[PDB]
């Protein structure tokens, strides 16, 4: 049905970790195939990759993967396959990788670099676990019970083995591991295989004989089987080692070990004649070792020629020097240092006059000097005559060359004999282990480092045996040339083995690779899996090829590994590439009771009440996504992986720790009897079995065998004593786990708590889905440490039930049968007396232990949490979509956002945000305020966060989420959204307190995703199908557009109104500024589809026209303020943006709007009937601006005084505007009025800045006239199409200028008046005074302003005209100027409001500073350095247009040669929005800020989410979509 996992990829192609589960491996869940389906009838899993839109890997991007395309295709490690990434700047691309058979699969990416070269990412691996079933029942990988048995101790007949089989079948083990059943070598140890392709002839003969026995175990006792596979060595007496002696490391294949061979045979030649002339054979004296090492420091070390293996033969170089005296003379260079610098001189001869392999160990005299090149230097340095002190000089050089070799020799020798007298002690003289057997044909003084034989080729060989080191890195092959192990004698050799030499591939050892393959695929035909001993010592490429060969034979191969790498990462990397399915963990390794508790905690599961993952605000919500209406698209028999909620966002694939196979005792560690006692066998195996993983045990652990059986020597047979030891308990433990394996699935479905009080260890196991669980109390018997009483066990909101209890007791010692390995007699005594109290008020359960609970005892309780039933996951993950059905884009504002001051408007000052103790308040009262805090908590599973603490300390926040919506209950769909929350929050409170936090975030997160999806559904298609970064900016519309009670856009009705920004510009009069509204009107409402809401805003300000202007501070129409020379032209520009985008937008012009003002600019006749008298259509309103602007406007700030502005003096009150018709631009403003977007009013009394405007923009602002040209260009085409009835503007005096002529006057004079030429030659045409100038290639900021140097200032204001009126700009002048702004005025997220070179560059805004610095005090520096995000929008808007026309690399066109940009241009756009993507991504407030200090430093005062800061970035995405994505 639906077995699809989502694997999100980063901008660099790396997988995204959805949760922090630690250093892990991308593993896919072990689930059975669907009902009646075999391998091949359908895909096992579908990995859906997600590549971001516009990422650097989209540029000519491909997806490589070794996943075979279909089931008919086999697997090859290097046979990758191409997949095309569908590039887009809006829509992310999904690519499926259907998997048909388990194994190891990797993927990498190829893309086009910024250097236009090819580049590749890492190989990223993911593993699909095999499907284990015995008769037909699926065996979950974490319900496996493995019983390891040694072959040579089970009787010499097949039926003798089937007696041992029936014994472990009663103990209810489901899997058996075998030591390899092959013909064993000389030592008969099970790991020195005589012939890998021949099974042990004592028992079986044919291959069907062993295959029929393993299938018998499957059909008789329901037991799967697996075997050890030996890669690293073979027996030291194989009849094929004589034919192919090159399969191992010999003097030919690895010549560096020759120095170690002549030393090993210097001891087999010494340990048989040592005492003959020496003295001590086997004495237990310190002096005996000294004289033995004195016999060593005189007959082996000193008898090997001072080791010429390092030192250059001094006198044999001078002899070979003079022998020719360099007939080939060839040095005239001066690269030789002076003879004084004897250090570099020695290195110089070493770097030039040496045969290849200098320093590299090989033959006896393999480090020699190139004579013809050495005598050439000697003739150059000293003399061309030999008798001129060459014998002294040449020897002086070589002696200094061998000084680092003489000291490398002393460091080697000191380690050879120090390792010797340290092991021969432990080998013989009982330090802690004795057996002092003297000289022998099997036990000399030194163990055999090399196996000697005479091969069939005739020559003699000396293959080495493998072993181990101490703390040495196991990845380093000690048998390779990189290690000096066999020489320095640091090898714990295993004589029965012979280190097998694999190369870089089958090319280095052909017969070894061919024989091991046929040996691996022979066992793969029979068994269900393998066990790899010392896998960390097997090289990766060796195991990768052989495990793939096995999986091609057995597709469901189950691999267990003994993996000990230095880091968890290397262990993960080994599991990633090799395809390992289980990592062995040993319980006997814990030295104390505390270490076993920590080992148990590691593989036990996740904490109780652990957080669950939910797609929050970090996911794209496509409006065209499938859904399960009531979590009903999951039939059980389909075995489909479930999505998180009703929204079918598939289950994310994240790196999880590799699965573990916990062994209470392996076949190599000592017996509980040896390390601890025989009593601890019961609690140890009880804590092991309770873990959430696979378990295993060696045979003899349950039967309480005496001591660890030596796998080399012993020949005794297992005893047939049935039901001994723990056999009765393991039958209860394994059968219990069989019931749990039915419903325990994912990592979030198995929770656990462990406690350690002395010799007791507590294990609480819990299934998070149903509430079921077990409680285990195990008293550990490491040492008999006296009577200890455990306190009262108190369970919260739970009920307990006694299951069983036991105690293992020793009834003396074990028999000493020399024919059968019998165990220790043990009594299994069932216990009682466990008092289970249950308070029926607090629902608390108390458990008390009886005084008779000795060490080596356990007791098991079956628990069940109250409140949690099986139908709880279904109730919470359903109904949220239907609840959000009636939501509107306005109503979703109250569900998710609402700042605290906005909430106070509806609650009259009684509610606000739920103050989380020891933290603060969420940013929004809605769900978003929780989600921003909850996401990083769920990611880190932080149950210690103050939010998690408060959630389990009470139910205050649980009811606060539901009780807020009483303020907004009457709005569209909120009542049904609140009702869903109320019913789910009610069900949550009936749960244990520690489980409220995990379920609280889940209920909030699911209702959040269905609300955010409801937003993409109501909005348009360009938004709903885009990337998270686009949808994140789109939600700002819902944020800003909110109905209030203290304000609105209409004076008669409190309807929806757009805020300038949260939280400061959201309440009362300071909410909707006309300038801020209409700059954002195209980005927040038009780009998203809020046409009706955008029309209401246009009609609302149309009633407030006065002085031929649109008011800045809109007082909902109830007496506003008209200090806005900028508002009217951003307002009329939004009219053009409305008609251009909205289908049928021309209807706006003929929309009557009740003119609440006498057109003759009067005072404030508010309720006077003249307000409700006449109206003016938008058409009239538009022309009213133009005609009155240049024609007739003359006003002082109406109804002024401190009531209006307190600081702005009377000089700023009387302000005006006039168009110089000899240029056509809109001049106006005073040096006392800040009627532009840079509206700053001084207020520092301590600097005499009171009333002084911070940035007065009198004259012709680039933005004002730029929007005027766009207005004129629009109104012309309006009449050409047949609407706008006006064509001539009335001149002030009484004349009549034409509109197209006014449109032409700007076109003929605008760029002439503003542009500053880069060349001083053309300063005579563009009206420039070169004395007051800053940078050339600059478009002006103001024309004939008050202070003429504010004219020639680099500011981001010109780019508004570059976007609304591109016809005023010649391409090369505009592109050359916008590149300067990108190099100077562009911050990371905000646009610098002033050139950093200009003296007035104060880029640190501080409105609390009340000092004497004119700018910094009281925030006068507002627009003199600080970086604003909205100007960045218009900047990159024109950066797209002009760099498209100008530079040709940004062009490639395509279909119908429609001009479409290139990947290089999209790469220049994407790279300038990632600092913006970061901001909203990692900001609590979901949005971009109003301000930003120098280089993105968070301005403390800046409103964190601003309207026109985000709408200006949404404007860019509409251009790239409406002009190319067709």
Ligand X SMILES: OC[C@H]1O[C@H](O[C@H]2[C@H](O)[C@@H](O)[C@@H](O[C@H]3[C@H](O)[C@@H](O)[C@@H](O[C@H]4[C@H](O)[C@@H](O)[C@@H](O[C@H]5[C@H](O)[C@@H](O)[C@@H](O)O[C@@H]5CO)O[C@@H]4CO)O[C@@H]3CO)O[C@@H]2CO)[C@H](O)[C@@H](O)[C@@H]1O
Ligand Y SMILES: OC[C@H]1O[C@H](O[C@H]2[C@H](O)[C@@H](O)[C@@H](O)O[C@@H]2CO)[C@H](O)[C@@H](O)[C@@H]1O
Ligand Z SMILES: OC[C@H]1O[C@H](O[C@H]2[C@H](O)[C@@H](O)[C@@H](O[C@H]3[C@H](O)[C@@H](O)[C@@H](O)O[C@@H]3CO)O[C@@H]2CO)[C@H](O)[C@@H](O)[C@@H]1O
Single residue of 252, 315, 1194, 1206 touching ligand X by CB under 6 A: 1206
Single residue of 1339, 1422, 1430, 1442 touching ligand X by CB under 6 A: 1422
Residues 6+ apart with CB under 8 A from 1144: none
Contacting ligand Z within 442-461 (CB under 6 A): none
Minimum Å gap between C-beta 1333 and ligand Y is 7
Minimum Å gap between C-beta 1231 and ligand Y is 15
x/- track of binding to ligand X for residues 1503-1522 (CB under 6 A): x-------------------
Distance CA(1055)–CA(1047), nearest Å, equals: 9
x/- track of binding to ligand X for residues 1103-1132 (CB under 6 A): ----------x-------x-----------
Containing 1032, the helix (H) or strand (E) segment is helix 1028-1040
Among 1121, 1126, 1129, 1106, residue whose Cα is nearest residue 1070: 1121
Contacting ligand Z within 862-901 (CB under 6 A): none
Residue 133 exposed, middle or buried by CB count within 10 Å (0-12, 13-18, 19+): middle
Among 229, 82, 249, 71, residue whose Cα is nearest residue 578: 229
Minimum Å gap between C-beta 1432 and ligand Y is 23
Contacting ligand Y within 1304-1333 (CB under 6 A): 1332
CB 852 within 8 A of CB 832: no
Distance CA(381)–CA(388), nearest Å, equals: 11
Minimum Å gap between C-beta 25 and ligand X is 48
Closer to ligand X by CB, 483 or 1036: give it.
Answer: 1036
Single residue of 1334, 1407, 1446, 1523 touching ligand Y by CB under 6 A: 1334
Of 269, 508, 668, 915, catalytic: 668
Single residue of 517, 717, 1400, 1407 touching ligand X by CB under 6 A: 1407
Percentages of the chain per state (helix, strand, coil), in multiples of 5: 35, 15, 50
State in Å, rounded, how far the first CA of the chain is from the last one: 34
If DSSP codes are grouped into helix, strand and coil, which group holds residue 848? strand
In the annotation, is 603 catalytic? Answer: no
Of 233, 536, 659, 1064, catalytic: 536
In the annotation, is 1189 catalytic? Answer: no
Spell 286-298 as b/e; 16+ CB within 10 A means b. eebbeebbebbee
Closer to ligand Z by CB, 676 or 1121: give it.
Answer: 1121
Residue 219's CB is within 10 A of a number of other CB atoms, namely 10
**Which stretch in 109-117, 1082-1090, 1203-1211, 1269-1277 sits in contact with ligand X by CB under 6 A?**
1203-1211
**Which stretch in 602-610, 722-730, 1224-1232, 1347-1355 sits in contact with ligand Y by CB under 6 A?**
1347-1355
Q: How far is CA 546 from CA 77, 233, 798, 1363, in A?
A: 11, 15, 51, 64
Q: How many CA atoms within 13 Å lie on the side-chain side of 1025?
A: 12
Residues β-bridged to residue 1342 = 1261
Of 533, 548, 617, 1239, catalytic: 533
- Beta strands in 1315-1403, from DSSP E residues, in sequence order: 1315-1316, 1338-1339, 1342-1343, 1391-1392
1349 binds ligand Y (CB under 6 A): yes
Minimum Å gap between C-beta 1394 and ligand Y is 10
1175 binds ligand Y (CB under 6 A): no
Minimum Å gap between C-beta 1203 and ligand Z is 6
Minimum Å gap between C-beta 1202 and ligand Z is 5
If DSSP codes are grouped into helix, strand and coil, which group holds residue 509? coil
Single residue of 124, 494, 1157, 1352 touching ligand Y by CB under 6 A: 1352
**Which stretch in 251-259, 546-554, 851-859, 1496-1504 sits in contact with ligand X by CB under 6 A?**
1496-1504
Contacting ligand Y within 1373-1432 (CB under 6 A): 1397-1400
Greatest C-alpha distance within the chain: 136
Residue 1210's binding partner, choosing from ligand X, ligand Y, ligand Z, none, with beta-carbon cut-off 5 to 8 A by kind?
Answer: ligand Z
Closer to ligand Z by CB, 601 or 1209: give it.
Answer: 1209
Containing 652, the helix (H) or strand (E) segment is strand 651-652
Residues β-bridged to residue 627 = 647
Closer to ligand X by CB, 536 or 1240: give it.
Answer: 1240
Q: How many CA atoms within 13 Å lie on the side-chain side of 29?
A: 20
CB 629 within 8 A of CB 646: yes
Residue 1201's binding partner, choosing from ligand X, ligand Z, ligand Y, none, with beta-carbon cut-off 5 to 8 A by kind?
Answer: ligand Z
Among 691, 698, 824, residue whose Cα is nearest residue 766: 691
CB 507 within 8 A of CB 213: no
Minimum Å gap between C-beta 1119 and ligand Z is 16
Containing 163, the helix (H) or strand (E) segment is helix 158-170
**Which stretch in 543-551, 632-640, 849-857, 1348-1356 sits in contact with ligand Y by CB under 6 A?**
1348-1356
Single residue of 421, 634, 904, 1069 touching ligand X by CB under 6 A: 1069
Residue 902's CB is within 10 A of a number of other CB atoms, namely 25
Determine if the peptide bond prior to 763 is cis (ω within 30°).
Answer: no
CB 705 within 8 A of CB 823: yes
Residue 1071's binding partner, choosing from ligand Z, ligand Y, ligand X, none, with beta-carbon cut-off 5 to 8 A by kind?
Answer: none
Contacting ligand X within 1281-1310 (CB under 6 A): none
Minimum Å gap between C-beta 1347 and ligand Y is 8
Minimum Å gap between C-beta 1197 and ligand Z is 10
Residue 1332's binding partner, choosing from ligand Z, ligand X, ligand Y, none, with beta-carbon cut-off 5 to 8 A by kind?
Answer: ligand Y
Minimum Å gap between C-beta 1349 and ligand Y is 3
Closer to ligand Y by CB, 1189 or 1340: give it.
Answer: 1340
Helices and strands (H, E) in the chain, number of each type: 42, 51
φ/ψ of 1469, rounded to 5, equals -85, -45
Residues 6+ apart with CB under 8 A from 670: 588, 707, 708
x/- track of binding to ligand Z for residues 1178-1217 (CB under 6 A): -----------------------xx-------x-------
Residue 1334's binding partner, choosing from ligand Y, ligand X, ligand Z, none, with beta-carbon cut-off 5 to 8 A by kind?
Answer: ligand Y
Give the pair of three-digit tokens for residue 860: 């098991």
Q: What is the DSSP letter of 1454?
A: -
Residue with nearest beta carbon to ligand Z: 1201
In the annotation, is 1107 catalytic? Answer: no
Distance CA(161)–CA(200), nearest Å, equals: 14
Distance CA(1209)–CA(1), nearest Å, equals: 75
If DSSP codes are grouped into helix, strand and coil, which group holds residue 915? coil
Closer to ligand Z by CB, 36 or 1202: give it.
Answer: 1202
Spell 1196-1216 as b/e; 16+ CB within 10 A means b. ebbeeeeeebebbeeebbebe
- Site for ligand Y (CB under 6 A): how many residues? 9
Closer to ligand Y by CB, 1138 or 1314: give it.
Answer: 1314
Closer to ligand Z by CB, 79 or 1206: give it.
Answer: 1206
Minimum Å gap between C-beta 1348 and ligand Y is 8
Minimum Å gap between C-beta 1171 and ligand Z is 25
Closer to ligand X by CB, 1405 or 1442: give it.
Answer: 1405
* Binding site residues, ligand Y, CB under 6 A: 1332, 1334, 1349, 1352-1353, 1397-1400
Judged by the rule CB under 6 A, the positions of this chain that interact with ligand X are 1064, 1069, 1113, 1121, 1204-1207, 1239-1241, 1407, 1419, 1422, 1501-1503
Active site residues: 533, 536, 668
Which residues contact ligand Z by CB under 6 A? 1201-1202, 1210
């Amino acid at each position: 049905a639906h077995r699809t996992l989502l694997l999100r990829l980063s901008d660099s192609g790396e997988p995204v970790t959805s949760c922090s589960y630690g250093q892990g491996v991308l593993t896919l869940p072990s689930l059975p195939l669907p009902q009646g389906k075999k391998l091949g009838d359908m895909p096992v899993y579908t990995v859906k990759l997600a590549i971001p839109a516009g990422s650097p890997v989209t540029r000519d991007g491909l997806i490589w993967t070794n996943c075979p395309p279909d089931f008919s295709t086999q697997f090859d490690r290097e046979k990758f396959y191409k997949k095309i990434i569908k590039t887009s700047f809006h829509e992310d691309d999904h690519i499926d990788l259907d998997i048909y058979v388990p194994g190891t699969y990797c993927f990498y990416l190829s893309f086009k670099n910024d250097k236009d070269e090819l580049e590749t990412t890492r190989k990223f691996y993911f593993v699909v676990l095999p499907i284990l079933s015995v008769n037909d029942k699926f065996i979950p990988l974490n319900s496996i019970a493995m019983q390891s048995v040694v072959s040579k101790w089970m009787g010499p007949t097949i039926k003798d083995w089937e007696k041992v089989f029936a014994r472990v079948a009663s103990k209810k083990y489901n899997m058996i591991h075998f030591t390899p059943l092959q013909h064993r070598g000389e030592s008969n140890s099970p790991y020195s295989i005589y012939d890998q392709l021949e099974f042990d002839p004592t028992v079986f003969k044919s291959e069907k004989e062993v295959a029929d026995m393993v299938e018998r175990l499957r059909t008789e006792h329901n037991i799967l089987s697996l075997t050890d596979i030996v890669f690293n060595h073979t027996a030291n007496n194989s009849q094929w080692l004589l034919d192919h002696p090159e399969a191992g490391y010999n003097h030919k294949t690895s010549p560096h070990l020759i120095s170690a061979i002549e030393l090993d045979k210097k001891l087999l030649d010494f340990s048989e004649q040592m005492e003959a002339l020496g003295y001590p054979v086997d004495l237990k004296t310190v002096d005996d070792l000294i004289k033995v090492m004195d016999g060593i420091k005189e007959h082996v070390i000193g008898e090997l020629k001072l080791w010429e293996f390092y030192v250059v033969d001094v006198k044999q170089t001078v002899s070979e020097l003079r022998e020719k005296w360099g007939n080939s003379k060839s040095w005239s260079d001066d690269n030789i240092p002076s003879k004084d610098d004897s250090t570099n001189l020695a290195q110089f001869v070493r770097d030039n006059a040496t045969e290849p392999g200098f320093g590299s160990l090989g033959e006896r005299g393999s480090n020699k000097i190139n004579i013809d090149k050495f005598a050439a230097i000697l003739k150059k340095l000293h003399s061309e005559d030999y008798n001129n002190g060459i014998e002294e000089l040449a020897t002086k050089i070589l002696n200094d060359i061998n000084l680092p070799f003489y000291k490398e020799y002393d460091d080697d020798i000191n380690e050879v004999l120090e390792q010797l007298f340290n092991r021969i002690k432990y080998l013989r003289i009982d330090d802690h282990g004795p057996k002092q057997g003297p000289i022998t044909k099997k036990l000399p003084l030194s163990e055999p480092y090399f196996t000697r034989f005479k091969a069939k080729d005739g020559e003699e060989y000396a293959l080495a045996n493998n072993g181990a080191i101490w703390d040495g890195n196991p990845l380093v092959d000690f048998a390779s040339s990189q290690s000096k192990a066999y020489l320095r004698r640091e090898v714990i050799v295993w004589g029965d083995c012979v280190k097998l030499r694999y190369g870089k591939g089958p090319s280095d050892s052909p017969y070894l690779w061919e024989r091991m393959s046929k040996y691996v695929e022979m066992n793969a035909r029979i068994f269900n899996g393998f066990r790899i001993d010392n896998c960390h010592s097997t090289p990766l490429h060796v195991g990768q090829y052989f495990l793939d060969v096995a999986r091609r034979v057995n597709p469901n191969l189950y691999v267990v590994a003994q993996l000990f790498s230095g880091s968890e990462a290397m262990d993960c990397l080994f599991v990633e590439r090799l395809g390992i399915s289980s990592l062995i963990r040993e319980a006997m390794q814990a030295w104390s009771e505390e270490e076993l508790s920590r080992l148990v905690h590691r593989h036990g599961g996740r904490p109780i009440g652990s957080y669950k993952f939910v797609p929050l605000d970090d996911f794209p919500y496509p409006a065209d996504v499938k859904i399960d209406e009531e979590y009903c698209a999951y039939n059980p028999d389909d075995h489909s992986v479930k999505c998180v909620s009703e929204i079918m966002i598939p289950k994310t694939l994240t790196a999880t720790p590799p699965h573990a196979l916990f062994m209470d005792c392996t076949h190599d560690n000592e017996t509980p009897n040896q390390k601890r006692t025989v009593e601890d066998t019961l609690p140890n195996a009880a804590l092991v079995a309770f873990c959430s993983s696979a378990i295993g045990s060696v045979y003899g652990y349950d039967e309480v065998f005496p001591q660890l059986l030596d796998l080399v020597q012993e020949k005794r047979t297992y005893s047939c004593a049935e039901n001994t030891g723990i056999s009765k308990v393991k039958t209860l433990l394994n059968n219990m786990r069989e019931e749990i394996a039915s419903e325990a699935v994912d990592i979030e479905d198995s929770e656990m708590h462990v406690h350690h009080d002395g010799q007791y260890i507590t294990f609480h196991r819990t299934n998070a889905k149903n509430g079921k669980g077990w409680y285990l109390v195990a008293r550990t018997k490491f040492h008999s440490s006296g009577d200890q009483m455990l306190p009262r066990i108190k369970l919260s909101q739970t009920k307990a039930t006694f299951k069983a209890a036991f105690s293992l007791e020793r009834t003396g010692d074990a028999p000493i049968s020399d024919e059968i390995i019998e165990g220790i007699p043990t009594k299994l005594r069932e216990l009682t007396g466990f008092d289970i109290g249950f308070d029926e008020n607090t629902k608390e359960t108390s458990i008390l232990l009886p005084q008779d609970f000795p060490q080596g005892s356990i007791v098991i309780f079956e628990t069940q949490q109250l409140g949690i039933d099986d139908s709880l996951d279904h109730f919470i993950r359903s109904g949220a979509i239907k609840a959000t059905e009636k939501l509107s884009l306005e109503s979703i504002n109250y569900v998710l956002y609402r700042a605290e001051q906005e909430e106070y408007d509806y609650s009259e000052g009684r509610s606000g945000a739920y103050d989380i103790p020891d933290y603060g308040k969420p940013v929004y009262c809605g769900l978003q305020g929780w989600v921003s805090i909850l996401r990083k908590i769920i990611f880190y599973n932080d149950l210690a966060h103050p939010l998690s603490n408060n959630l389990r300390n009470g139910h205050w926040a649980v009811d606060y989420v539901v009780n807020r919506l009483d303020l907004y209950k009457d709005k569209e769909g909120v009542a049904e959204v609140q009702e869903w929350l109320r019913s789910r929050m009610e069900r949550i409170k009936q749960l244990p307190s520690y489980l409220v936090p995990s379920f609280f975030a889940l209920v909030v997160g699911i209702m959040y995703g269905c609300c955010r999806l409801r937003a993409m559904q109501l909005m348009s298609d360009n938004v709903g199908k885009s990337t998270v970064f686009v949808q994140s900016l789109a939600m700002t519309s819902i944020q800003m557009v909110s109905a209030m009670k203290s304000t609105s856009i209409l004076p008669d009705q409190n309807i929806a109104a757009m805020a300038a920004g949260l939280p400061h510009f959201s309440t009362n009069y300071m909410r909707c500024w006309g300038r801020d509204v209409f700059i954002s009107l195209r980005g927040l409402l038009l780009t998203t589809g809020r046409y009706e809401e955008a029309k209401e805003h246009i009609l609302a300000f149309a009633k407030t026209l006065k002085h031929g202007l649109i008011p800045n501070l809109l007082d909902a129409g109830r007496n506003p303020r008209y200090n806005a020379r900028d508002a009217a032209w951003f307002f009329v520009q939004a009219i053009q943006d409305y008609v251009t985008i909205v289908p049928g937008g021309v209807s706006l012009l003929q929309e009557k709007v009740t003119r609440r003002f006498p057109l003759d600019d009067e005072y404030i006749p508010y309720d006077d009937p003249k307000a409700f008298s006449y109206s003016s259509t938008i058409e009239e309103i538009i022309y009213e601006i133009l005609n009155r602007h240049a024609g007739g406007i003359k006003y002082r700030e109406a109804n002024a005084g401190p009531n209006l502005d307190r600081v702005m003096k009377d000089e700023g009150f009387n302000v005006e505007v006039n168009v110089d018709w000899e240029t056509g631009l809109i001049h106006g403003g005073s040096q006392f009025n800040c009627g532009t977007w840079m509206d700053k009013m001084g207020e520092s009394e301590k600097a005499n800045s009171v009333g002084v405007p911070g940035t007065p923009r009198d004259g012709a602002a680039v933005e004002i006239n730029g929007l005027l040209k766009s207005c004129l260009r629009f109104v012309l085409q309006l009449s050409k199409d047949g609407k706008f009835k006006y064509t001539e503007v009335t001149k002030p005096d009484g004349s009549k200028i034409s509109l197209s002529s006014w449109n032409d006057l700007l076109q003929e004079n605008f760029e002439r008046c503003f542009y500053v030429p880069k060349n001083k030659e053309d300063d005579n045409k563009f009206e420039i005074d070169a004395t007051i100038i800053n940078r050339r290639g600059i478009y002006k900021d103001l024309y004939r302003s008050g202070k003429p140097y504010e004219d020639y200032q680099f500011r981001p204001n010109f780019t508004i005209a570059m976007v609304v009126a591109p016809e005023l700009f010649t391409p090369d002048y505009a592109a050359g100027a916008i590149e300067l702004a990108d190099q100077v005025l562009r911050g990371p997220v905000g646009m610098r409001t002033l050139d950093p070179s200009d003296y007035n560059y104060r880029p640190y805004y501080n409105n609390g500073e009340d000092s004497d610095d004119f700018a910094t005090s009281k925030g006068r520096n507002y627009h003199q350095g600080p970086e604003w995000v909205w100007c960045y929008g218009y900047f990159i808007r024109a950066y797209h247009y002009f760099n498209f026309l100008t530079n040709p690399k940004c062009q490639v066109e395509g279909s119908a040669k429609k001009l479409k940009p290139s990947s290089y241009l999209y790469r220049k756009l994407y790279s300038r929005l990632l600092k913006h993507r970061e901001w909203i991504e990692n900001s609590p407030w979901a949005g971009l800020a109003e301000l930003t200090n120098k280089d993105g430093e968070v301005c403390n005062d800046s409103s964190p989410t601003q309207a026109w800061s985000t709408g200006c970035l949404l404007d860019l995405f509409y251009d790239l979509w409406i002009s190319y994505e067709e």
